[PDB]
């Protein structure tokens, strides 16, 4: 279903990801800035 309305939303425009896991979106975001 529509599970894009998440509080842990990735703020990458071309990506447009949204998470429920803080430990997942953290690494997802770390790899975004290539760190
Ligand atoms: Zn992302």
UniProtKB/Swiss-Prot annotation:
Q: List locations, semicolon-separated.
A: Nucleus
UniProt PTM comment: Sumoylated with SUMO1. Sumoylation is enhanced by PIAS1, PIAS2alpha and PIAS2beta, and PIAS4, but not by Pc2. Enhances transcriptional repression, but has no effect on DNA binding.
Q: Where are the zinc fingers (C2H2-type)?
A: 8-32
Q: Quick one: signal sequence residues?
A: none
Assembly and oligomerization: Monomer.
Report the domain remarks.
The 9aaTAD motif is a transactivation domain present in a large number of yeast and animal transcription factors. In KLF3, the motif is inactive.
The free-text function statement in the UniProt record for this protein reads: Binds to the CACCC box of erythroid cell-expressed genes. May play a role in hematopoiesis.
**The protein's name in its UniProt record:** Krueppel-like factor 3
Q: What is the lineage of its organism?
A: Eukaryota, Metazoa, Chordata, Craniata, Vertebrata
